[PDB]
Structures are given as structure tokens and as C-alpha cells.
Design a protein around this ligand. Structure first.
Ligand code: HEM
Ligand code: YTT
Length: 394
């Protein structure tokens, strides 16, 4: 006799496990056990994933309630699970959104110059190069320092928190609180620094002294900086890293995008659709009894939305494992979520990858893995799937 299915199925981010297709066709909502020992519903078809994400009765903020079944332990204060709600209630949503657009002046040129500079340094050092630690992550870090308006030299200090902040742990993590309190204090100091006049933190620093915002807490202003740096850098760094693997594995596609770079936006959209960067389903707590497929989810139960369940669903994306640049529904994937909590940095994440890949194909058109693919070391118990090193030659 066996147990309930345990999630996650695999930490590998280069291929989807066969178990996902069997679950989707046979039991697209199914009971699973999480690493905390809690039970949850796993949803794995495009139709049911979209239903859950569009129904606000499946709540993200209630996942932080005491005594709720948990996917993993919180690494942030519980009020921060409601981060975007707190931002909107303070009247700051429009300000935050206009600061993280890729259309900000100098931003695209900064991204291009930084990507080229990183790749030139790698070419000078000679092969093998590590495209995660010496390209994808520094590019994500540099981009978010610029978007935030904070010194580039402070990027690596803030980055150091992320290997702990985004763990997917059964128990609370002592180091997460140490790093959180320290990073909050850094961002509080940025708000009092008169040299910080640009980017998101420059705008928040001005709004803090505006009478319309005098009753917004200093804690919220600092929290916006820490959370947007952290979520943005881990999400863009990890997506670009695993998109580069998908590209390297497909020399025909790599050659086509090198010859016709005007197809890079459509290629990136497919690379988003097939991306396995999210290591766990997205969690929601049922606030009511809700019918999902054949199952009545009860109030208080945990539901997990499996993004690669939806994004590889052949009923919505025929031939789902194939990158096809002429699909009729190309942005209808769930890589950025759906509904109330749709990613606010979607446009910035697209541009980061587009410019990173464009620069790579110009400088490194023969890029290939320097080791057999089974030699990549996949990070475990983490909210993203990423290889620890990505050694390439060219
Ligand atoms: C390719 C890059 C990215 C991917 C794949 C991605 C993916 C996602 C997904 C799937 C969600 C929904 C989570 C849920 O519903 O539980 C989300 C939300 C979020 N993302 Fe992104 N993201 C990316 C880039 C960014 C960037 C660049 C930023 C900020 C600079 C950012 C900040 C956020 C925030 C703050 C939320 C919470 C939204 C809310 O609760 O309403 N992300 N992201
Ligand atoms: O809990 C949150 N925390 C932050 C994201 C975050 C989590 C941990 C951390 O150290 C920094 C930011 C938020 O903006 N909203 C929510 C929901 C969330 C969680 C993870 C994620 O990848 C995206 C959204």
C-alpha cells in the first residue's frame, strides 16, 4: 500500500514529468500532500486552473491564516502575503505600476549595454562560462537596481538574501527573518537619502512627503522596495536561465532567432509558455464551498494551481511541447498568472528576456552546453527551479 501523491514531483526545470499529463487527463483535480504534511487539491488542466485563478473566493491573502493547511512556511511577515492589496489600499498602485514599466527613459538602452558588457567579459575570460551566475542573475540584479533607483553597487548585497528568502521549506527559517529585517532597514535608509531621486524608490520618497500620503506607514514604503526587488530578481533571473536551456536544446530555433531577430518577441512568448521556473503550484485558500470539476472544495482547504498543467494542456495548446511561433492564442498562457494577482511586472519580465536573448545570439551564436544536460545540479526545496551553474561553450 502507498500514500497520497507528494508534491512537488520534480525539481528538474528542463523537462516536464510524465506524471503531469496522466494527472491532467485522468484526475485534473486531485488530492496531494505538501512538504508540511498538509493535504491540498492539485489543479492541472487549463480549464480548471483558469477557473480557480479567476474566482476571487479562492484567496491568496487567506493562505497566511493561522492554522490553515500550508504549502510551505512563510518567509515574510503574514501581512506581506497581501502585498499588492496593501499597496492598493494606500493609494500607491498607479505609482508603482508606472515605475516598473519597460518604457522608462534610458531603461532599454541600459539593459542592452549591461547585457553586452556582461557577455564581453565572459568572452574575454574564455570558455566555459556560467550563464546563470555571470549573466542571467547579474542582468536581473542590475535591471532591478535601475528600476528601483538604488546604487548598482548595492545590488549584490540585496541579492544575497534570495537563496533563503525564496526557499520552499516545511519549517520557518531563522535566517529569513535576519535578512528581512536587515533589508527593510536598508530600504528605510534609502527613503531618507536625498541622492535617491529616480526610479521606484525616488518616486516613493517624494510621495512620502506629499500630504496626500502622510498616513501611509514608513514600513509599507520600505516593504515595497524589498518585495519588488526580491520577486522581480528571482523571477526574471530564473526565467531567463531556464529559457536559455530551452534555446540551447533547440539549435534550429536558436539559428532561426539569430537570423531573424524580429521573431524574438514571439519566441520569448513561447519560452514563457513552456517555462518550468515555478517549482510549486500557486496557492489559494477556499473561502467558501466551491465546485471545481468533479470535486467540491470545502471552505478552508488549500488549492494548488499547477502552471505547467495549464501551459502544456493539449486541449488549449495543441502540440504543447513544441515551440510554435505562429500560434493563434500566444499570450493566453498562465506564466504570469491570471485574474486579481496577474503579475504587475509582466512587461518588464518580457523585455528583460527579449533583450538578454537578443544580446546572447549576437555575441554567442554558437552557444552550447559545456556539460551533458544530466550534469546540471537543480536547486531543491526552493520556490523556483534553477540549475546551480549553467556551464556553456561557444
Ligand atoms: C519572467 C518574469 C516573471 C514571471 C514568470 C512572473 C510570474 C508571476 C506569477 C505567476 C505571479 C502570480 C502569483 C500568484 O498568483 O500566486 C506573479 C505575481 C507577482 N509578480 Fe511576477 N513574474 C515575473 C516578473 C516579475 C517582476 C519583474 C516583478 C517586479 C519588478 C514581479 C513582481 C510580482 C509581484 C509583486 C507579484 C504579486 C502580484 C499580486 O499579488 O497581485 N514579477 N508573478
Ligand atoms: O507573499 C507574498 N510576497 C511578496 C513576494 C515576495 C516574497 C518573498 C520575498 O522575500 C520577497 C517578495 C508579494 O509581493 N506578494 C505575495 C505573494 C507572492 C508570493 C511569491 C511570489 O513569487 C509572488 C507573489
Amino acid at each position: 500500500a502507498t500514500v497520497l501523491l507528494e508534491v512537488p514531483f520534480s525539481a528538474r526545470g528542463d523537462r516536464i514529468p510524465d506524471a503531469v499529463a496522466e494527472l491532467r487527463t485522468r484526475e485534473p483535480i486531485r488530492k496531494v500532500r505538501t512538504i508540511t504534511g498538509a493535504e491540498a487539491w492539485l489543479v492541472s488542466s487549463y480549464a480548471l486552473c483558469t477557473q480557480v485563478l479567476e474566482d476571487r473566493r479562492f484567496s491568496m491573502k487567506e493562505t497566511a491564516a493561522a492554522g490553515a493547511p500550508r504549502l510551505n512556511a512563510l518567509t515574510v511577515p503574514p501581512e506581506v502575503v497581501n502585498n499588492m492589496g496593501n499597496i492598493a489600499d494606500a493609494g500607491l498602485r498607479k505609482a508603482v505600476m508606472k515605475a516598473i514599466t519597460p518604457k522608462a527613459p534610458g531603461l532599454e538602452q541600459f539593459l542592452r549595454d549591461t547585457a553586452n558588457s556582461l557577455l564581453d567579459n565572459l568572452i574575454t575570460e574564455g570558455a566555459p562560462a556560467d550563464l546563470r551566475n555571470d549573466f542571467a542573475d547579474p542582468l536581473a540584479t542590475a535591471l532591478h537596481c535601475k528600476v528601483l533607483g538604488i546604487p548598482q553597487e548595492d545590488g549584490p548585497k540585496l541579492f544575497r538574501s534570495l537563496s533563503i528568502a525564496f526557499m520552499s521549506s516545511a519549517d520557518p527559517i531563522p535566517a529569513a527573518k535576519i535578512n528581512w529585517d536587515r533589508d527593510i532597514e536598508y530600504m528605510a535608509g534609502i527613503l531618507e537619502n536625498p541622492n535617491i531621486t529616480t526610479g521606484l524608490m525616488g518616486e516613493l520618497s517624494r510621495l512620502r512627503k506629499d500630504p496626500a500620503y502622510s498616513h501611509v506607514s514608513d514600513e509599507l514604503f520600505a516593504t515595497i522596495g524589498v518585495t519588488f526587488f526580491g520577486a522581480g530578481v528571482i523571477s526574471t533571473g530564473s526565467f531567463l536561465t531556464t529559457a536559455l536551456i530551452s534555446l540551447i536544446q533547440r539549435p534550429q530555433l536558436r539559428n532561426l532567432l539569430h537570423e531573424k531577430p524580429e521573431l524574438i518577441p514571439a519566441g520569448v512568448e513561447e519560452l514563457l509558455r513552456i517555462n518550468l521556473s515555478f517549482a510549486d503550484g500557486l496557492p489559494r485558500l477556499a473561502t467558501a464551498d466551491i465546485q471545481v470539476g468533479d470535486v467540491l472544495v470545502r471552505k478552508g482547504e488549500l488549492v494548488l494551481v499547477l502552471l505547467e498543467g495549464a501551459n502544456f494542456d493539449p486541449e488549449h495548446f495543441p502540440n504543447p511541447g513544441s515551440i510554435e511561433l505562429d500560434r493563434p492564442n500566444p499570450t493566453s498562457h498562465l506564466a504570469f498568472g491570471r485574474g486579481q494577482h496577474f503579475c504587475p511586472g509582466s512587461a518588464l519580465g518580457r523585455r528583460h528576456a527579449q533583450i538578454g536573448i537578443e544580446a546572447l545570439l549576437k555575441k554567442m551564436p554558437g552557444v552550447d552546453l559545456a556539460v551533458p544536460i544530466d550534469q546540471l545540479v537543480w536547486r531543491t526545496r526552493f520556490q523556483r527551479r534553477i540549475p546551480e551553474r549553467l556551464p556553456v561553450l561557444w
